[PDB]
Design a protein around this ligand. Structure first.
Ligand SMILES: [Zn+2]
Ligand SMILES: [Zn+2]
Lengths: 488, 488
């Protein structure tokens, strides 16, 4: 392209997502057009995750994401306090409304009253509902598409249980699916962990998270979250039943909240992206193999052109027979060299070159998007050899990104190591008192020496925390090893 | 239930959709909760249609369905005149916005400017984009869920072409897919046809439509539409290229618009529904076969209970192996008789009863939701015999509804036959001048003698229009046989 990734990331990223026809800037801000290239990736993720959560007993539904003031003033539902911002609709044209209506506000405001209605007995539990929708914020700084965006697409699940053991179960299950989406579909390694008291979700008891690392900016990013809410909302909303083990006082529902967004795509783009542009993991690529007729002359036959085209469609029908996603760019108007670059910049995993010389030898050429390696392949071994290169591409992408995580995620036991390491461009696991004010402190001091933020308290830390080890503050004993870094 | 379909349709319909757990009334109006039972049907339709249009080269995307006034006053885009109502957002809380932003307004306002940008050469054509989203109106009378609703889910496709032949092609193709969705997935017979000058889409040259008939209300309903827009919008939006056949003056894009909604479900419900509640066509049922252990006594063994349950799961795993959607209601808390009624009212096509007496004889019982017919089935012939009953159920539902269309869609050649027939509760095909004022007339006179509306000008009329045949008005010659009836 026109920008190196290792010189100007921001320019590089902007040109990559535009030239690959993934997004188009819209006549809003922090709001963009999701073109089919990008949308396809989301749909791939959507297909996988949708299948998995259904094995868990979660069902999809639709909730009207608006509400009347007439319900808020009268306390049919409630708005929590930690939750800005509720944008209202006031004017059906230039004729102000009898009932003005609130946009968003929160999923909780809209859903939980209905959960309350649906829960009469213990028989009516669990309640596990997911929805795929869109959600808008109203504050920005300089919204990068995908990473920090005002508008996005996502799913969020809301579950209600009779016990805590059940609720706790789903939280880790769902978090793992998210870890799969990153590690399996996107070939992006993540760090599973719990969020600190500061960074956790205000409305819940605890928040689990997956954290992905971006070695370009040297920052980390939150992949997805699974919240245990406990009874904080079932009390606030009177979602309540009675259990014949105690017949009885009224017992409250245990709840869960989990969401994954389109930022996955931005992570994918930032991790795997090339100076030749996008590069897609075969698991999510709209097109994994592109068939391109190479060799056309302005002196070539007209029976050979019809034959060359027929061979391209022969490969295509065969690859379709093994569930490979394949396109044949059979166009007069563009040079093959153009098509090469066009699909290279859109990061199609395999380029399948079909030329008459090779076609004579009853063979073809497969080119890898990642390494750029060309392998001559027998026509007979098309289905097997190509499926093998796709799998090997997925593995290579993940392996490489996994080697960046282990290399840029190290341990610091003091504050002066911590600052030294963080400014090298890594994320760090440190001994931590676990205290909000100390977190606030670390952010402030690390900045002008921006600031390092708490990412998660990893389920599996690199090292064991020695008894008597102090937090980096020095004023307190360290409760747990905690992962810190400048984030998105 | 608590209401007969043939006494109080409105009550019957309201209880059917609530008791089958399809929808829940929300704290808005004309706005409802789409529960997973209903949502599943939409997802079935979504899966089929999504596949078909992709064979046509249409790709999915996402457009931010809001816009800034800052774009409307400055004429970056335009708002058409026939298009109310543009509700605005003004208040991010109680702090009015620098940029207030418009909701909806029209897909055209948001998309076509970008189409214009995307079209530079003839190479950049066609442009075929679909999106699955949600759309809100702001006027009602007494919004029935699904039929006439303020809020709904739908898809709409927008296509741009270099020629008219291409555009014309897609219109009929897309309309046919809609006809399939009704006739194949929903087993609902439809009448394909063109809309009159009055009822057509203001922004387009012509509008094609599918019309379904509901013998309960005696009314018809519009299933879906495919619009040819011609150049009306490519001129309005400067979507323009140049063609080397004439190099050249600037030629304009030919455009298309097609949408299908969730009203399908309401049609399905109204056509096939029972006095025992919902009944689902196997093609769209979330669950086609429900396995229910029958025979449990409070004197039954505890090794036979573990055996009976194992047999239920044996059938279940087998049916899953032939891509049948199956559930085993293995619950302690409800009588089998309860489960019978519970799934009967949710209209599960086949009830699969597993009892110990039958289990001794190495057999089971399959019950049809439609006819209520029970057939004793050998365990060995589970996969074949059940798949055969499902197909036969789909056929039976469609056949019956097709026999209602032919019976309630007749020909009238005068105005006094027309009124006689229409008040019997049928839809009618009449000789028609094709004139808006006459249409307006027919609506007025037919009402107090509400009013009959034009449905479509059928591609294939029942009878041939004899030369010299007069329109029902009598003041004009009849251009074409036209289908009329009171509608939704
Ligand atoms: Zn500390
Ligand atoms: Zn007339």
């Amino acid at each position: 392209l026109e920008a190196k990734k290792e010189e100007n990331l921001a320019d590089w990223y902007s040109q990559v997502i535009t030239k690959s026809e993934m997004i188009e800037y819209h006549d809003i801000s922090g709001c963009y057009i999701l073109r089919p290239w990008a949308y396809a990736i989301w749909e791939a993720i959507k297909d996988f995750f949708d299948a998995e959560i259904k094995k868990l007993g979660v069902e999809n539904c639709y909730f009207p994401m608006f509400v009347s003031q007439s319900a808020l003033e009268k306390e049919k539902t409630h708005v929590a306090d930690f939750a800005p911002e509720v944008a209202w609709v006031t004017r059906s044209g230039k004729t102000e409304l009898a009932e003005p209506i609130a946009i968003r506000p929160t999923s909780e405001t809209v859903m939980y009253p209905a959960y309350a209605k649906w829960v009469q007995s213990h028989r009516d539990l669990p309640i596990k509902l997911n929805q795929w929708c869109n959600v808008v914020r109203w504050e920005f700084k300089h919204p990068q598409p995908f990473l920090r965006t005002r508008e996005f697409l996502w799913q969020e699940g809301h579950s209600a249980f009779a016990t805590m053991e059940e609720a706790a179960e789903e939280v880790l299950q769902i978090l793992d699916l998210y870890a799969q989406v990153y590690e399996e579909l996107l070939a992006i390694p993540v760090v599973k962990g719990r969020k600190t008291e500061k960074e956790k979700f205000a409305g819940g008891d605890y928040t689990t998270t997956i954290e992905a690392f971006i070695s370009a900016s040297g920052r980390a990013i939150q992949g997805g979250t699974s919240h245990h809410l406990g009874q904080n909302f079932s009390k606030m909303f009177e979602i309540v039943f009675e259990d014949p083990k105690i017949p009885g006082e009224k017992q409250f529902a245990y709840q869960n909240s989990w969401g994954l967004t389109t930022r996955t795509i931005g992570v994918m783009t930032m991790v795997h992206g090339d100076n030749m542009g996008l590069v897609l993991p075969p698991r999510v690529a709209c097109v994994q193999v592109v068939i391109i007729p190479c060799g056309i002359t302005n002196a070539l036959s007209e029976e050979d052109k019809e034959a060359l085209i027929a061979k391209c469609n022969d490969y295509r029908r065969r690859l379709l027979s093994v569930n490979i996603r394949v396109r044949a760019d059979l166009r007069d108007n563009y040079s093959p060299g153009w098509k090469f670059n066009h699909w290279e910049l859109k990061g199609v995993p395999i380029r399948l070159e079909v030329g008459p010389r090779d076609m004579k030898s009853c063979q073809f050429v497969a080119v890898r998007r990642d390494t750029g390696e060309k392998l001559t392949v027998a026509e007979n071994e098309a289905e097997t050899k190509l499926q093998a290169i796709l799998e090997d591409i997925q593995v290579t992408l993940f392996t490489r990104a996994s080697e960046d995580l282990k290399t840029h995620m190290v341990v610091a036991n003091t504050m002066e190591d911590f600052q030294k390491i963080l400014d090298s461009g890594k994320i760090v696991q440190i001994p931590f008192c676990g205290e909000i004010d100390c977190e606030d402190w670390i952010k402030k001091t690390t900045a002008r020496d921006m600031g390092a933020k708490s990412l998660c308290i990893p389920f599996k830390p690199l090292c064991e925390l020695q008894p008597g080890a102090k937090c980096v503050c020095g004023k307190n004993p360290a409760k747990y090893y905690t992962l810190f870094g400048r984030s998105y």
